[PDB]
Paper text:
The interactions of sclx8 with [name] were similar to those observed with sclx6, though less extensive. At twice the size of sclx4 it might be expected that sclx8 would mask a larger protein surface; however, sclx8 formed a [name] dimer [Figs. 2(c) and 4(c)] resulting in a total protein surface coverage of ∼950 Å2. The double-cone conformation adopted by sclx8 minimized its contact with protein surfaces. Salt-bridge interactions involved up to three lysines from each monomer. Here, again a hydrogen bond was formed between the Lys30 Nα and a phenolic OH. In one of the protein chains Phe31 formed an edge-to-face interaction with an sclx8 phenolic ring. In protein chain B, Phe31 was disordered [Fig. 2(c)]. In particular, sclx8 behaved as a bidentate ligand that facilitated [name] dimerization.
[name] is a small (∼6.2 kDa, 55 residues) lysine-rich protein (13 × Lys, pI ≃ 9) and a potent agent against Aspergillus species and dermatophytes. The NMR structure is a twisted β-barrel composed of five antiparallel β-strands and stabilized by three disulfide bridges. Lys30, Phe31, Lys34, Lys35 and Lys38 (loop 3) belong to a conserved region of [name] that is important for antifungal activity. Despite the varying size and conformational flexibility, sclx4, sclx6 and sclx8 bound similarly the Pro29-Lys30-Phe31 motif in loop 3.
Residue numbers in the entry: 1 to 55
């Protein structure tokens, strides 16, 4: 599935709510694009492939 969440810069992590309403965390990639560039930026998670892209 594809979820949209919000990321935090320092921890470089995406937080999204799954369909049960549970906050779930998945680290952004560390190097260049796909890393979180500002607190509360959008991030898109693909739970089929365990992949995230952070803004």
């Amino acid at each position: 599935a594809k979820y949209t969440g919000k990321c935090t810069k320092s921890k470089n992590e995406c937080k999204y709510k799954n369909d049960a309403g549970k906050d779930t965390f998945i680290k952004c990639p560390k190097f260049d694009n796909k890393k979180c560039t500002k607190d509360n930026n959008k991030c898109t998670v693909d739970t089929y492939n365990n992949a995230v892209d952070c803004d």
